[PDB]
Amino acid sequence: DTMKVINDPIHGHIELHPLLVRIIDTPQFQRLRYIKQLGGGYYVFPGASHNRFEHSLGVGYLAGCLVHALGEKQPELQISERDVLCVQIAGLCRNLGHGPFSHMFDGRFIPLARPEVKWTHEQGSVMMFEHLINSNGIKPVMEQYGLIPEEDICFIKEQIVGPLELWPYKGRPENKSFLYEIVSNKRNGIDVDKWDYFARDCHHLGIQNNFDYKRFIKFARVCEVDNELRICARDKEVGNLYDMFHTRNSLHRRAYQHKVGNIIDTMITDAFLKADDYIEITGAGGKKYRISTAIDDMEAYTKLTDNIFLEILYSTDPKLKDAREILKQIEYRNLFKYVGETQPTGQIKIKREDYESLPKEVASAKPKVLLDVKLKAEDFIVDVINMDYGMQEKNPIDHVSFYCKTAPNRAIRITKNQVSQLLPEKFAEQLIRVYCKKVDRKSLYAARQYFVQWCADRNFTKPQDGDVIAPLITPQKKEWN
Amino acid sequence: DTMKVINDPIHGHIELHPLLVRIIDTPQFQRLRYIKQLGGGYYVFPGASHNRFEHSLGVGYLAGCLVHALGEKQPELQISERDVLCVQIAGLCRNLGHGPFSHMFDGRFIPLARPEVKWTHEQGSVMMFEHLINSNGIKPVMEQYGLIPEEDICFIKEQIVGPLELWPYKGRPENKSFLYEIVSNKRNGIDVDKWDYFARDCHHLGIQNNFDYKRFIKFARVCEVDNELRICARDKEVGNLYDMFHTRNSLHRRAYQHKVGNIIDTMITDAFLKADDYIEITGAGGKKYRISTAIDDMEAYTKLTDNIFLEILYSTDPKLKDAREILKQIEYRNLFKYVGETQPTGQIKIKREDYESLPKEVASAKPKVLLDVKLKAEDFIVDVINMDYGMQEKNPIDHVSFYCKTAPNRAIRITKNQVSQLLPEKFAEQLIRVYCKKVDRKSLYAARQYFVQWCADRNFTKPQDGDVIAPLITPQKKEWN
């Protein structure tokens, strides 16, 4: 075995060490070719045909770039080939746990199908990784290339999911703490995963990426912070970091949370729920699993991909008729109709436990307007989106360490006010989208009146088109005009 | 209904007329989302996740751009909105007949599964188009927007597949002849289909595109040629056109005929053949079809996409065991091994009827070298590739008309010698690739000796690495050294 070269449109020619090739050439990894990165986003942005596979290669490549760069600048860190390979493998493998249509599956479907469970793609990645290693005899190959499976497997998993519980990590000691900041940065979110998806998603979406990760890599250094060795950024690059999160937020606003992409994800989720009793996936020892239970057996999960969509769409079984009809309405573009968007005001924050009650509230509103139809709770969908800088209300740049050119080994902190007054005052907000499942002209007119009335009753912000869609409703609220 | 905007990474924001939206939002068209543009190419170029869907949008867009541009420069042509819509629809729909993995299906699978049939994606496109129109009530909508279904449906089909047999077309008269040169140019191959795939494939492959279609559109004009109105290019742009075909050939050499992408297509084709008896696809009136017969019923063909690959891979049926094993070997990257490449010499041309005899010839060669194993015909795959400028031995630029700035309405011809002596002397050639199905070190060593010996016996060109892979064989042939 020798090194392979892969040509990636985003990063160019990437070299893969033979051990990485071995990990990649397994059913568990190759599975990612059949999972769209952006789920339902492809149904709005036709360039977004890309899958988790190629993103994982990129993440693995960049993880290697950063660890190599640090080793070259700072030989005193004693970064070994072994460390590099482990960081690359964690990079390659942090997406292994994704399900059909990526975030649709763990963000919408599993929470509704198995409310009692607490599941994340991160956890799934660790489980799939263990399955990949054991099913394919990778441990001996790791030993052949100088890795120590016991410690290094633990390291790799910790890089993906955090401590499997004071230094809380066992795979490496504090003197190598900075290695835990590369693939999945739990401290402030600044990691190579973002860097790849910014660049790759932009390339495919047809929207231009504003963040320069190559620059960041050039200016990164390791310094001592509170008895840990951590990655620090050059002081003057702080603005670029603020911009990185701004870019992330723009991408969510323009693409990842696109109102129609989301309703498509929602429709697909509904079809999966209606199919979940009837689709069987064979796992370990021939045992049969459902879409919602395949997460319990990695052998079954290996075979759970976007393919399920087409299996349902092309099914002839009358049991799958309701699920199949939903997908067919997607194809004919008879989608649930977007009614509008609003936001909470002041300190008001909508809790997850209240999401189910919201359609009922909308249907209970009593707009003083003449209506041909009356709508019921089940006619409304309410989608609540939490937008933030990756740390709820917290500013991630408060959790970043910097260095200055006159003392490159001395770590410092930079506050928001030392950067600019043009920065956000808050770092989190919620958007509420409302859609109507009845798509005829009269139902939609009515849905608009209910929605705007509900916004007024709850003291939410005025929808942007409120005066046009509900001219009889908006004047009651002085605050709006 | 009003016009929709779609954002495409290649062309930007494309406007779609409501009638086009209606055609697009049907199962027949949306199907193209599940068919990879480059088939097995994705297994070599991980950026090439793109599907026929987005390519079709682009072709439809560019077709519109060119016809609009000509109408704006030359009002005297009397190009109508009706003409524009018809050309856009033909652009959109010329890929409707593609099967799983695009060219794999009509280039390898159908020829082996149904040798008696003569099938092409072009023919399939016309059938799928008719099916799309009839199944979805499109005719009334066409009338609503000023089209005349009888004439215009004929025009659209003729644009895709040529005369459905003097002027041989019925959908438009000779004064609109130039319209037939936009979507699928049967005269010289210069059409909007190439322009989109050059740009889109390059974007995804990570290889840079050298052809500027926007420039070409700016310099295009309609002039009278032999009592037809044809599209002419500005004289000085002739070099750019030679370059366009050079680019096409480079793309085939680097990507579309990549030796490993082709062997993956071949392995997938073999799995399909082994599954063909057992997969059933439901068509019109509940009748059941096979992969190879789905082409006879468009209702069934609608459901025949890349999904078949995963249906086989994930199958548990013991009947599908052999097919499923082939695909699994793809996942583990245990692929048939490439042995080498050579070309015929002089006037020698390999005929299609002789393709089957070639593995037998290779196995019959008697290299004077010590071999642990003897290989048989069934161990060898011989792939013959015809590379040309789109017209067999003919130079397509001999079939292009030009105009000069001093007389923009007078069409002229330009010969190769009026352009450059650095151009090709021939416009067609054949490549022969040999692979071995036995992948162990000793079988591959042997396969190399047989292959090189066969090249020598047939007086084919010396493989580039011949002296390295078969040092005992190459010296016998004086011609090589």
Added chain:
Amino acid sequence: DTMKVINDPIHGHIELHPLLVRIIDTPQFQRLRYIKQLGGGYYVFPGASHNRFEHSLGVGYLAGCLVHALGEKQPELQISERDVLCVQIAGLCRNLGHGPFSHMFDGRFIPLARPEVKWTHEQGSVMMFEHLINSNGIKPVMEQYGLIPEEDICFIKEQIVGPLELWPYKGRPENKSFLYEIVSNKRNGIDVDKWDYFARDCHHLGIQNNFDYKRFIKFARVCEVDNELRICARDKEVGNLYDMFHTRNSLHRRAYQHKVGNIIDTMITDAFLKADDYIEITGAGGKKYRISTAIDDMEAYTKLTDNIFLEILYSTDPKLKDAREILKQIEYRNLFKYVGETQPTGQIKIKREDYESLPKEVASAKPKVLLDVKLKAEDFIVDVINMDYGMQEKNPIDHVSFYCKTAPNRAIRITKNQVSQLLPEKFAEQLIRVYCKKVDRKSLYAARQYFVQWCADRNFTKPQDGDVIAPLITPQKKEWN
């Protein structure tokens, strides 16, 4: 004369009407080839070799695109070919008044050389335009293509500089008000000039552009607002507009106000001041002008370009020795040294009349630290930069009109709170940079102590590296720590 095509790396093949060609092919316009778009920026960003010439072509092109797009969507506006040409010409000609090194000349040099004068490149553009027309016999050519010089020349000038003083414009009536929003938008700054520079500067700088003007053009419409016809943007595009200004601010932070690019501009300005007595530029009737007075005669101003830099650098005249030495220090990269950056706190705002007093304040600070050298006012440079969203403290999106899909003719307003809580709370700030003209190690150490002490005394923000450069100074200030 017929239309010319130009190939631009940003916009592709641009078509130029013959009248535009005639305007372009004059000494007054071609001058712009010898004036760098980014001035001293090229000395930091080596890709920024681009000149005002090519930017002007782009602005003229985009101005045409927008006016054409609006006319095609809304024929009822009665936009004429004449209107289009006039808007294109204003676009082409709004940069004609730039001087050597663009903003350096009217932003730094003229204010210091001729404090009594009030001069702007805008004013210069109008003067140069009039000169161009009269010197080159353009009026007859304009009449030949259907323009009415009296009204249209007025219109063009008004588009550049605003009313040459109710409806305050004379070149077009209120029903064509929207035309005044294309080239130089005095209401909110959203114009084609920005669009071209964002794209072109980014292409040359090596920083990626986040704003999509093509999208914006597609969604733009004209609606009635307060008895004027104005350009409106689609409601949901409001986020993209906020982002456009954010992008502009990032470009200023990263590139246009780069600390070293600015000090280079400052050094060049100083050399020009020292040369201003001795360089003579011949204007109308052989009369001689200086660099600072060439603005009074357009014939002389025509010959005032970046060339002055080299004329000084290559001079042998002993009178120009001091000016020439400054430029030589640029070449050897012996630049004034950047000491640091800080900002005012609270309501504090530095007025233009106080800029001269600032070096003196820095030199008067009394840091309690042992210093080998004492520095004087003349050793310090203080550069005060006003950063905003183009309207001082005002939010430009408050001055934008929108429309919604359900009523495309009805203009509406959108507030900040209807968009996001992640937006800036303020839209303007000031940055203060300090540099030292003594570049030796001991002077620079001292300069750092003075600077930080001055920040503390004035209650400015703590410099980011303050604790490292002045550890003995920073602890006195509790606010900092």
Added chain:
Amino acid sequence: DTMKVINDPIHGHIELHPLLVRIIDTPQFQRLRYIKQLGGGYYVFPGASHNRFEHSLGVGYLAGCLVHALGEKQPELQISERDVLCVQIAGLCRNLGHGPFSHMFDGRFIPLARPEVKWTHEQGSVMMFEHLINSNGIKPVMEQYGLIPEEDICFIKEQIVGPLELWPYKGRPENKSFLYEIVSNKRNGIDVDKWDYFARDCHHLGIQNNFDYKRFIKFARVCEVDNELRICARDKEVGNLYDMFHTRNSLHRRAYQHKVGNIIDTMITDAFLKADDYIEITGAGGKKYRISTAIDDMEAYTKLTDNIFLEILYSTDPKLKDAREILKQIEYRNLFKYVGETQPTGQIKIKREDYESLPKEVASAKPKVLLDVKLKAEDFIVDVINMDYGMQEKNPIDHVSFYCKTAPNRAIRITKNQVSQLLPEKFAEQLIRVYCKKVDRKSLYAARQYFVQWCADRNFTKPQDGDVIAPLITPQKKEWN
């Protein structure tokens, strides 16, 4: 001093070793900021504002990339940091000898002004380099970083211009022969200089680059060939190399030899010739030089840049009136008129000594057509362009060595016939362009008749528009029709 980072739009963030920074920050190098890469090309392609400075940085960067890559793959080569720095410096400095408007100066001007001299930019680069080193105290700095000035300066110069005289080089021995193939490859032309200009020129021209140098670097290796260690390319990459030269030839056809860019270069050259007696450039010890003699004194040559154009344009001296008028006609776009293009036939090859006789031949032709004016030799310009693959009639790929994956240390040769029959049969040709200095309609009509008659008399190829521009002349020649 520590390493600097520069952001280049083509290569990204490039790191510069402190010694390189010192070389760059001198008047001799910074000079290159005032010399356009493409000369008169900017007057046709307005994006091509780029200068030799930024190209030199890129060449220096890529030279470092390649030497680093080879050292990392093959530690047994013993490539030292010293070797790397020397190769970078040669890359940085191989453009130091370019004159105003780059190839215009050594390709047109010097050959006409100083026919007796044999001058090339290469020679100029060595002289400027020596001047740079000596004038700026660089030798000590080189010693400080481990270079040995005697040997290393010799090595650097040899890399630029070849042996200054079996192994003909003194700066390194045969075991380091491969180092001489990086910056300026005298064997086959495949070097980092091309790679940068392909990418950078394309970026600025608005034409897309087809060659992937990063790929080439990844597949490059050093192997023993005829008792030298040389750079070898992977066998299968041979097609990409053919394509690289095809790309180079396309760029010449489309841009570098653009008919109008060339006539502008010719006009500028004529102005320089007319100014050469009167412009004085001050060199060593105050001595005065002319444009054509500044090459004899590097102090003077340091000050000879594109500035000369503007010095002439802006001059008031009546002696410079004729030169100044030529440049003014450029600004008004009153250029010499292109008449047509043709090529020699068969074995016919035009020698340099016959270039001067060609205008006379054109004027002596006797077209049997009625002409209002008779034209003289001095009215015609004949531009003869030799287009090739960099080695006259020779195929450079015959001078490239390859390796195969099965024996990476064994160098091999590949012939054209082992690659493709679609490759050129010849590797050199000549183009003849004719222009007329009389631009009125009747002169140009007449010029066309003379030109086509001359083509017919000389048995050159038929101009593409021949039948249109000279319908009475073309029928006499049966060969044409």
